[PDB]
Amino acid sequence: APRSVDWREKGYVTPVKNQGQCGSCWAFSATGALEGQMFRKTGRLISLSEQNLVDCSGPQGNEGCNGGLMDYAFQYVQDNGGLDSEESYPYEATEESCKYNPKYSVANDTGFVDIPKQEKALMKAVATVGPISVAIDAGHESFLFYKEGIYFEPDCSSEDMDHGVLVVGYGFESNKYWLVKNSWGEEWGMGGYVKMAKDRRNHCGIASAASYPTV
């Protein structure tokens, strides 16, 4: 159980992406976690398609630009046997017709693992699996305008998370934080990342809906 962890240092994370004005955060959180597992498997990091998730994962329960869950995304990837790369199926920040094409699938999983709802549990998955999809309460103006530092919202709900994101590690400043990759672009926060209060009673419920695909 290491002191600090940062999967960006090992080539597991793709650059920061932008969901644009579309409620497809679940999809970016999903591709993020998937991108990291495939890497741990094949050794190759390849950006995955969120538009692929937004357009065809309705059967599993997702609502495209109107909402979804990372697990419905892993499930879709499981029932569909594959997922098209980002290049092949570019992102358009809007719901289009399903255009999946097996010829371009570059990833796949065989389920997912819902992590026990405890921060200590999240810490081990992060330390021993890689980037983890999680959901936090980001419905506060302070989060939207987070610039840098360790984010702490004494108004954050640990039960009503509304934003899916990617935990890429954790550490502490010379005070413990979770390293989180957001999908609002690199202009947001610290190059698109945020350091969130760690071991502070599941702040914003970050450890309450953690999960990752099994490839």
Residues that are catalytic: 25, 163, 182
Least distance to ligand NSZ from the beta carbon of 125, Å? 15
Least distance to ligand NSZ from the beta carbon of 99, Å? 21
Ramachandran category for residue 205: left, alpha or beta (phi over 0 → left; psi -120 to 50 → alpha): left
The DSSP annotation for 48-92 comes to: BPHHHHHHH-TTTT--GGG---HHHHHHHHHHTT-EEBTTTS---
Helix axes 70-79, 25-42, angle to 10 degrees: 60
140 is in an annotated binding site: yes
Least distance to ligand NSZ from the beta carbon of 183, Å? 8
Binding-site member from 100, 146, 151, 184 for ligand NSZ (CB under 6 A): 184
Give which of 57, 52, 58 is closest to 90, Cα–Cα. Answer: 52
Is 63 near ligand NSZ (CB under 6 A)?
A: yes
Please identify, using beta-carbon distances, which residue of 30 and 106 lies nearer to ligand NSZ: 30
- List the x/- string, 19-48, binding to ligand NSZ by CB under 6 A: xxxxx-xx----------------------
